[PDB]
């Protein structure tokens, strides 16, 4: 309970506007919204997983009640503090709360934890809750058509509220409150970080966004809390063993990145579900190896899926369009059908087969492409998510995946490891999917994206993937070139010429602690050795794919890190030149 | 006689990070609230202890309850369970919860400990009575309306985390979740050393090293029971006249010393809680075959050291972060050293391949015992076709799914030659494609053991799609030094007189009735006549044939153990090995 | 008294004058509920009993629930209401064996008690699936209780039973019988004329409603749409 409003709720801006236009603006401007006879809802249910922001949205709506009286009166009740030991005061108090809601006309009643007030009536149910449901239903049916009282109710278990209140004329419009996605977690982490004395760069907030698949806003708040506490611990470890208050300056405590990496393992994943593929941009180490090929792929996907001018039609919220952009100004039906049928005619049948050698970074390229298509809907058809056995056969699971891709356009149907998918998934399932793609209009944005290792091009011209349109849409991943391999190993050689007075490590605390108040050497490494080891690294990894380049990199990084503390890196260069033989 | 109530924090072994975190959250918000205001954060007021039975949860709550009642400022401990909350009247359970929280706010520096909290606060269900969902709702409300200064701490131990309601386990209500694991070898050493601390004749350090090496799978309760039954076996053999006497005979307690044989006898008569209904933990190399394999196994422990960075990273095992911050200074935007440190792990695979036999069950158990921090995932058919109707693929994919979320992990396939014939083609394709969907820096060891596998069809073949390229071990047969050191414990059994055996010797001299209140005939040319042909018989033998020969000769030597003339034992051995 | 026994409180702002494109089923529904209440002298002359059961089946958002609610608010007048019970096959306690039979018997007791009644089952194949199916969770005793509790031949009274479903295949073929569900009505995705009629219904209470030509264009551009 604080003075909390919006601009604190990240990743749910669209829902607030949808709720404001559904709830707040029809209650506020009936001169506008009664012109079209659209009735405001009697009951609106916020449901979702725990920690997803559902009490925040009602608290922010009640700070939107922080306005002048007789407008948007807000009542804040729970699934408790209504129910009592007596037999009447619960139902009498509910009738009275609704009568005071009618008394101030435009009014909202919010029931946080509505499963506490309205559980399922059965024969293990109490009488007093069953009568609370029996009066709340009759009060909701008593509320008039000219809707001026709106009852919002929140639950984290929606099929544990009583079924009666979900019937028409009751709590019938729902808002699902999911766990946040990556940009939503980025905004939430920014929101938690905002008012710190020493700031946090936006790249680290993006990395912490990509590390927390499964984290609600409560989880990200407590992750920041434990990061602050780990930083206070490492900055002043003497305030912990004191039993008396020490004079500590709170300005020298800065929450670093190592504190966040310790708070990541100090925080329980809370149904993270880190399974299968994750859309994630190409990692910084292999980014020299697959940057230009991924750029060619991104340009080919822009031409194919028309992403250069839509980016979901320059819309993710319609409200920001209607204030910044001036519109173009019934003879407009023929014009709008013409320019819409020409805008949808850009998309024919999207199909991309990304072929490559064995172990040429396809698991990185596919994840970076699915990070590039964030505004799409990904339906992964890999083997581990089809044989996950949800009490259905895999034909049914393929068919339902295609249905969900077809419902939520623009979407991708992402098949990684295509040459393994061909031999593993049965032939009639591949023919079912081929029929599902033949029964598709040529104006539907369902990209069929397939990544293969060493797939024989005969199988897509006259084999089982021939009835998939992979005619001119084969991208070949090349093995990376000499410039890419050179820039790949330049970071390794930069790690080599790095002095042991610059490599962070943990030696013993040989100095005493400050015991607070109670209230000049060169790395011996010649440039000819650097040039020779660069030439040997380039000459060894000739026509290497990305995986066998990563192997050479891992081995040489092991060698370099073994002689980490040496000041004369000659037995390092001798080990490295000897290894590449 | 009974269990303690003044246990201090030094009687708890193996959980030092959690002791430091509990001390932090009971002391630091009381003294320095400005640090919780400088950063805009609220100190955590809720902990959930969870772990296997007998691992330290009620012990740490007891130690904290004793620490609450010693110092110059007094923290009030409030102990509850489901019995003294649940009432048979309408609205009386929730009233008792509210009286607890109000009384703890009144005595404001306060701990509230709910033990077996899944029984007090189960997952809310409409197929249960309304009192349990009502108690969960009242608890959620009372936790959401606490003091908001770190004054009332709420600690709960559930033994099973899944049973508790997910609304209570979200940050805001129970912020921290302390996982009390089964102790590893340093923790088991420290626990056993705590148990054998007030003993008059002490235990050594090398023996507790051996004793913590052999007790994998034990909780702290199982190790305390190991010292208890070891001590009672010592009392039993030191003074067995106690057990047939209905009145108190005088004994001398200083004449009782717990022997190594008594501990080794107590190890046989004790099943830990983790194995009391299940299969026991993977054991190390058994003591007889350590000559035949250990040096070869040591080569494996080097090859698995330069491919996983074992000893370099795991030097801090559930240790206190606070003592690491006190003991080691930081150097103090430049986290590409994280990227090169992650770059040392490329995709770690190991195929330990050898002849038919050759102790590969022992080697696999030894390696899985050596990697106790890793999460092993067993893809042998004893577990894949175990829970039936589930399907091998839903088991194999699930097994890979727990191998890529709880990293470091080991995907363990023993009998790989049998596995790639008795496992459906799709599982290998689903597993091979699941492995090549991983990033290269991701610590999932693919450990595979095979007897007489075709190395030409692992470059090609079904295992072509795994990177068994230059990380393929070779378990060659034991060598003559190792076979000779192996059989040189069998010659020691030949050199025992029948008066040297600790076997069942009769009592002629009866019980001391307490105060109430020759030469072995073994020629040294026979003692190498045995050994030269014993080594000559075991030519290019594997580990299994060697221990079969050892078993036969040990039967022959053991049946003539009552005799001092061992010539008729020698010629039977020479006749057998021929 | 403690069960799901509440009447769904209907609004009189839903009638057949707000339904588009389904006039045959409305005319067949007048002789089922409204005319036996209004003209009981004529049904007694042939000693006939009207069909007490009908299965609404069709794709989602085509107006099966709307047809039932308008049926309730059609002959609820002349101080003679139609008590509307609406249940669903997606309830958590619907597959609760032991409890679900008690709830169904109590629902049919309370529907017999408020004599002109309508029971509407929103997803009847969730409640009465095919007993010869291949999922393990199937309660045959629930379906036999639903079979014997509804009876258009045994004179319970003026209780109309309505079931709604997407396709009548998934419903038990024991429930598609002259005693239980006499009639089945297919509620289709509306065609161009019925989409014009629905879009004329959805805009007739505006300030400046759409023109006829504008509505015709909207009906054409909404191919594949239901009324919802």
């Amino acid at each position: 309970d604080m003075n909390v409003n919006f601009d604190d709720i990240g990743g749910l801006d669209n829902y607030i506007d949808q709720l404001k236009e559904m709830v707040a603006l029809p209650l506020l401007y009936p001169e506008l919204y009664q012109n079209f006879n659209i009735t405001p809802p009697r009951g609106v249910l916020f449901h979702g997983p725990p920690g997803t922001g559902k009490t925040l949205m009602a608290r922010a709506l009640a700070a939107s009640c922080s306005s002048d009286e007789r407008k948007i009166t807000f009542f804040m009740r729970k699934g408790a503090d209504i129910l009592s030991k007596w037999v009447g005061e619960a139902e009498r108090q509910l009738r009275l709360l609704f009568e005071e809601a009618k008394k101030h006309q435009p009014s909202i009643i919010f029931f946080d934890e509505i499963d506490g007030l309205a559980p399922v009536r059965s024969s293990k149910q109490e009488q007093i809750h069953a009568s609370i449901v029996s009066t709340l239903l009759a009060l909701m049916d008593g509320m008039d058509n000219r809707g001026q009282v709106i009852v919002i109710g929140a639950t984290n278990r929606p099929d544990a509220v009583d079924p009666a209140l979900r019937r028409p004329g009751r709590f019938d419009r729902e808002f699902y409150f999911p766990l946040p996605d990556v940009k939503a977690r980025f905004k939430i982490l920014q929101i938690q970080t905002r008012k710190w004395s020493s700031p946090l760069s936006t790249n680290f907030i993006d990395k912490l966004a990509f590390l927390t698949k499964g984290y609600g806003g409560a989880d990200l708040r407590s992750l920041c809390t434990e990061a602050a506490l780990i930083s206070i611990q490492r900055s002043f470890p003497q305030i912990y063993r004191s039993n008396d208050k020490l004079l500590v300056d709170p300005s020298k405590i800065k929450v670093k990145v190592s504190d966040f990496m310790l708070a990541l393992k100090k925080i329980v994943p809370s149904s993270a579900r880190s399974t299968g593929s994750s859309p994630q941009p190409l990692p910084e180490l292999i980014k020299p190896l697959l940057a230009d090929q991924l750029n060619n792929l991104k340009n080919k996907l822009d031409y194919m899926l028309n992403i250069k001018d839509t980016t979901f039609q320059r819309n993710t919220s319609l409200l920001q369009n209607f204030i910044d952009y001036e519109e173009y100004s019934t003879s407009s039906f023929r014009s709008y059908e013409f320019f819409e049928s020409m805008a949808e005619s850009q998309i024919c049948k999207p199909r991309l087969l990304i072929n490559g050698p064995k172990g040429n970074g396809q698991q990185y390229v596919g994840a970076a492409i699915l990070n590039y298509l964030e505004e799409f809907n990904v339906q992964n058809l890999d083997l581990a998510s089809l044989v996950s056995e949800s009490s259905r056969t895999i034909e049914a699971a393929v068919v339902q995946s295609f249905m969900e891709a077809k419902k939520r356009q623009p979407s991708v149907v992402f098949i990684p490891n295509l040459d393994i998918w061909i031999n593993t998934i049965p032939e009639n399932v591949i023919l079912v999917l081929s029929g599902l793609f033949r029964s598709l209009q040529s104006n539907e944005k369902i990209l069929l994206l397939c990544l293969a290792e060493n797939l024989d091009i005969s199988e897509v011209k006259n084999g089982i993937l021939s009835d998939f349109a992979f005619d001119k849409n084969i991208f070949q991943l090349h093995k990376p070139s000499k410039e890419n391999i050179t820039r790949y190993f330049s970071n390794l050689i930069e790690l080599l010429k790095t002095k042991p007075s610059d490599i962070p490590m943990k030696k013993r605390r040989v100095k005493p602690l400050p015991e607070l108040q109670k209230v000049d050497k060169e790395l011996i490494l010649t440039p000819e050795q650097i040039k020779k080891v660069s030439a040997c690294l380039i000459e060894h990894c000739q026509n290497f794919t990305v995986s066998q380049l990563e192997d050479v990199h891992s081995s040489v990084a092991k060698i370099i890190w073994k002689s980490k503390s040496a000041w004369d890196k000659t037995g390092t260069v001798d080990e490295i030149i000897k290894f590449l033989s | 006689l009974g269990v303690d109530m003044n246990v201090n924090f030094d009687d708890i072994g193996g959980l030092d990070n959690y002791i430091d975190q509990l001390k932090e959250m009971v002391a630091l918000p009381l003294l320095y609230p400005e640090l919780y205001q400088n950063f805009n954060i609220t100190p955590p007021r809720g902990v959930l202890f969870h772990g296997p039975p007998g691992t330290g949860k009620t012990l740490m709550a007891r130690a904290l309850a004793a620490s609450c009642s010693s110092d110059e400022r007094k923290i009030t401990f409030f102990m509850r369970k489901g019995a003294d909350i649940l009432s048979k009247w309408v609205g009386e359970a929730e009233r008792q919860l509210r009286l607890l929280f109000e009384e703890a706010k009144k005595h404001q520096p306060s701990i509230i400990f709910f033990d077996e909290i899944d029984g007090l606060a189960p997952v809310r269900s409409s197929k249960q009575e309304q009192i349990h969902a009502s108690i969960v709702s009242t608890l959620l409300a009372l936790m959401d309306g606490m003091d908001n200064r770190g004054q009332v701490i709420v600690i709960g131990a559930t033994n099973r985390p899944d049973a508790v309601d997910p609304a209570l386990r979200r940050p805001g209500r129970f912020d921290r979740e302390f996982y009390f694991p089964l102790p590893d070898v340093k923790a088991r050493f420290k626990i056993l050393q705590i148990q054998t601390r007030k003993w008059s004749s002490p235990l050594s350090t090398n023996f507790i090293d051996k004793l913590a090496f052999l007790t994998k799978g034990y909780g702290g309760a199982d190790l305390r029971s190991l010292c208890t039954e070891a001590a009672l076996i010592s009392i039993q053999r030191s003074f067995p006249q106690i057990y047939r006497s209905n009145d108190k005979l005088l004994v001398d307690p200083s004449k009782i010393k717990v022997k190594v044989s008594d501990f080794m006898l107590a190890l046989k008569k004790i099943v830990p809680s983790s194995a009391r209904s299940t299969g026991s933990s993977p054991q190390p190399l058994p003591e007889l075959i350590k000559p035949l394999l250990a040096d070869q196994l040591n080569n494996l422990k080097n090859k698995l050291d330069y491919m996983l960075n074992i000893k370099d990273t795991t030097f801090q095992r559930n240790t206190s972060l606070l003592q690491n911050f006190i003991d080691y200074e930081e150097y103090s935007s430049y986290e590409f050293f994280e990227s090169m440190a992650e770059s040392q792990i490329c995709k770690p695979r190991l195929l330990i391949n050898g002849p038919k036999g050759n102790g590969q069950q022992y080697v696999g158990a030894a390696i899985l015992n050596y990697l106790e921090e890793f999460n092993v995932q067993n893809l042998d058919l004893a577990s894949l076709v175990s829970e039936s109707s589930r399907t091998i693929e839903a088991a194999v994919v699930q097994s890979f799914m727990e191998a890529k979320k709880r990293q470091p992990s080991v995907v363990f396939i023993p009998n790989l030659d049998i596995w790639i014939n008795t496992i459906p083609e799709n599982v290998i394709l689903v597993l091979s494609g699941l492995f090549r969907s991983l990033q290269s820096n991701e610590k999932i060891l693919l450990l595979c053991l095979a007897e007489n596998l075709d190395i030409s069809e692992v470059k090609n073949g079904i295992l072509s799609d795994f990177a068994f390229d230059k990380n393929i071990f070779q378990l060659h047969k034991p060598s003559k030094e190792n076979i000779t050191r192996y059989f040189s414990n069998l010659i020691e059994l030949l050199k025992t007189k029948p008066s040297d055996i600790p076997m069942k010797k009769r009592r002629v001299k009866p019980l001391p009735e307490l105060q109430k209140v020759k030469e072995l005939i073994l020629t040294p040319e026979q003692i190498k006549k045995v050994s030269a042909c014993l080594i000559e018989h075991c030519q290019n033998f594997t580990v299994s044939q060697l221990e079969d020969v050892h078993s036969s000769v040990a039967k022959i030597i053991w049946k003539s153990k009552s005799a001092w003339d061992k010539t008729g034992t020698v010629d039977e051995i020479i006749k057998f090995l021929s | 008294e403690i069960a799901d026994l509440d009447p769904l409180g209907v609004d009189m702002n839903v009638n057949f004058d707000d339904i588009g494109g389904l006039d045959n089923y409305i005319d067949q529904l007048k002789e089922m509920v409204a005319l036996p209440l209004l003209y009981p002298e004529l049904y007694q002359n042939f000693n006939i009993t009207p069909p007490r059961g009908v299965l609404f089946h069709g794709p989602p958002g085509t107006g099966k629930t709307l047809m039932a609610r308008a049926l309730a608010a059609s002959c609820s007048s002349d101080e003679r209401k139609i008590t509307f019970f609406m249940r669903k096959g997606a309830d958590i306690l619907s597959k609760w064996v032991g409890e679900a039979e008690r709830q169904l018997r109590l629902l049919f007791e309370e529907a017999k008690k408020h004599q002109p009644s309508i029971i509407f089952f929103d997803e009847i194949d969730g409640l009465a699936p095919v007993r010869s199916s291949k999922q393990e969770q199937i309660h045959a005793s629930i379906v036999s209780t639903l079979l014997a509790l509804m009876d258009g031949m045994d004179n319970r009274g003026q209780v109309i039973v309505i079931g709604a479903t997407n396709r009548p295949d998934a419903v038990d073929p024991a429930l598609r019988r002259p005693g239980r569900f006499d009639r089945e009505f297919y509620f289709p995705l509306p065609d161009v004329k019925a989409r014009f009629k629905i879009l004329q219904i959805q805009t007739r209470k505006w300030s400046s409603p759409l023109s006829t030509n504008f509505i015709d264009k909207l009906a054409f551009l909404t191919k594949g749409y239901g009324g919802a």
Partner: peptide, 15 residues
Amino acid sequence: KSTGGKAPRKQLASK
């Protein structure tokens, strides 16, 4: 799953 319940809360209600 079908199991039954406690005879309902007495509601003493005198104090």
